[PDB]
Structure 1
Amino acid sequence: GNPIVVVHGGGAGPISKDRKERVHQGMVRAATVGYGILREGGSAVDAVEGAVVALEDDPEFNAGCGSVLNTNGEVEMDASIMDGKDLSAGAVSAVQCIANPIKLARLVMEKTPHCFLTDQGAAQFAAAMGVPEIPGEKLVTERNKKRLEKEKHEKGATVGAVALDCKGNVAYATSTGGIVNKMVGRVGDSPCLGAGGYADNDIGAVSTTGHGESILKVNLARLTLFHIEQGKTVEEAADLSLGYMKSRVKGLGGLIVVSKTGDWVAKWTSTSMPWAAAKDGKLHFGIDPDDTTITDLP
């Protein structure tokens, strides 16, 4: 039984030669953790969580440490995780002062009769679960402070993973800092099932990135899976769904897909999207269209 892990960063382009290598190493690390969990017989859920925790902790990515700032220069995070076997899910929105929103989303799934907690109640739940509070300042990066000032002045005028485990289970995890200069309490697509991602053993798993409002309006992740159900390949499904978002709501973004049959793809309508996939002892990586590197994974 051949397990697969696919990871994505946020559509980033253009980037400096030296930052491109840090992004590359970050993607490799996330996919290595994810694949490593799968190879030891771990679940698709553990794999996607492991991969996303890596990207949250990595300051080079828009999730956890490295999250973009809202209008007040604060880090407000969203995350969701879904299990394709029983459709079990966990999600958090407008979370602050925690290192790993995806672990909190996993906790919502496993420890509550719910699948979505927000802001104050999500903060209270994190405290009750013994999740350590970190200075909100430890999530803020200088690059994100500059981005915010740039955005505010111009106005003068989103990571994830999908997996198929050894037992045939599929899962997705999506985590974000949102959009630069967002309003206080703005909720994106990331914590919303069907938009931020979707996982179903009878179809496959999707994790998305891009303009959250657009992803929400088109239900991007569930839409992708609807084309797969209708007989389209993972590539056709991704193209059709992304294409529809572009034409209908003028939205750009990207997604990663894994079908129940083991087919996978990473596609985007934005400039770039860092991505990596691991399957059959091989690591696939890319950032720009039609520029992919494949290396052997012992």
Structure 2
Amino acid sequence: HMEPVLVVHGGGISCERRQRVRQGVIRAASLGHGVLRAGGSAVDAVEAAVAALEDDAEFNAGHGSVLTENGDVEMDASIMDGRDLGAGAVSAVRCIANPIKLARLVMDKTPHCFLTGQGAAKFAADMGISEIPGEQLVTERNRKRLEKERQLGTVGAVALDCKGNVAYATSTGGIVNKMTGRVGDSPCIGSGGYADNSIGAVSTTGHGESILKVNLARLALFHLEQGGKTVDEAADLALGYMKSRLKGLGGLILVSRTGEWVAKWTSTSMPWAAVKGGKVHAGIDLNDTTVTDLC
């Protein structure tokens, strides 16, 4: 039996904002950790944590997603089971409250790993999931950001369950003013995340095009798997390469198969929280990390 670990991240700050964002990552991580403490799977727990961050309007996924060039919300998500490399993903999903829950259904109920657009909507209907009015996903802060851009990152979770299984989930609204039908890294296995019981699990955030081009999640783990490196060093190398090769900035969370974990970023900030044992860890910048008793 392994001691379970759940890590979450938000994206990339009106001080009353800092505090709600911090509260949101702590809530989603404690929620996912609760699943693991009850004997649920790593997959069950990442789904739960990421669906909570989707429902939280302060984060760029589900409700609160950034807007496309058309003032529309288009969402991407992916989930992976490190035991059998099971995977599900959805891209350019519209009018769906919880894209990560649809991605998990692609994984579990179809022989495919990735559905897009109208195909993903049809499958959602076949699963009994209802469409919601598009404007319910849109916030006034995001309308404003859209106008500004015409003259935020992802959400994610990694887990290690009591049986030694790892999983990631990632979900996002994308990048503000994106072209209709743009697909970023978050639904793409290898880039937005990767999970393998032989190594570990990763979920990423940042400049999606750079993340895709270096396959950042899978890269962090190649570094971990070849030896002589801790989770910290493996993550700094992977993010180090993205920055040096492409100038692309971002962040990642990583949990090894032995339960060591890290949150690292080369952007200015990355909301994150982790729960292991009886302690909750969280922060946003280099200097504001806190640790408190779980309850």
Is the shorter-chain TM-score for this pair beyond 0.5, marking a shared fold?
yes
Alignment of 1:117-266 (within 5 A): 117-153=115-151, 158-231=154-227, 232-266=229-263
1:106 aligned to which of 98, 104, 107: 104
Query: Quick one: distance in 1 between partners of 2:210 and 2:74?
Result: 19
Identical columns (%) = 81
Query: Quick one: distance in 2 between partners of 1:104 and 1:275?
Result: 24
1:47 aligned to which of 41, 45, 48: 45
Instruction: List, as ranges, runs of 4+ consecutive aligned residues in structure 1 with deviation greater than 6 Å.
Output: none
Query: Quick one: distance in 2 between partners of 1:288 and 1:236?
Result: 19
How far 1:281 sits from its partner (Å)? Answer: 1.2
Query: Quick one: distance in 2 between partners of 1:53 and 1:263?
Result: 24
Alignment of 1:17-96 (within 5 A): 17-96=15-94
SS at match of 1:160: strand
1:285 aligned to which of 274, 278, 282: 282
Unmatched segments (≥5 aa) in structure 2: none
- CA RMSD in angstroms, aligned pairs only: 0.6
How far 1:178 sits from its partner (Å)? Answer: 0.3
How far 1:250 sits from its partner (Å)? Answer: 1.4
SS at match of 2:150: helix
Query: Quick one: distance in 1 between partners of 2:241 and 2:176?
Result: 25
1:230-252 deviation per Cα after TM superposition (whole angstroms, max 9, x unaligned): 11110001100001001111100
How far 1:291 sits from its partner (Å)? Answer: 2.4
1:267 aligns with 2:268: no
1:217-275 deviation per Cα after TM superposition (whole angstroms, max 9, x unaligned): 00000000000001111000110000100111110000000000111000001110000
Query: Quick one: distance in 2 between partners of 1:281 and 1:175?
Result: 27
Query: Quick one: distance in 1 between partners of 2:22 and 2:41?
Result: 25
Query: Quick one: distance in 2 between partners of 1:164 and 1:141?
Result: 34
How far 1:193 sits from its partner (Å)? Answer: 0.2
How far 1:290 sits from its partner (Å)? Answer: 3.6
Query: Quick one: distance in 2 between partners of 1:170 and 1:255?
Result: 15
1:2 aligns with 2:29: no
2:294 is aligned with what amino acid?
A: L
Corresponding position of 1:115 = 113
How far 1:128 sits from its partner (Å)? Answer: 1.0
1:173-229 deviation per Cα after TM superposition (whole angstroms, max 9, x unaligned): 000000000000000000000000000000000000000000000000000000000
Larger mean CA deviation between 229-238 and 54-63 belongs to 229-238
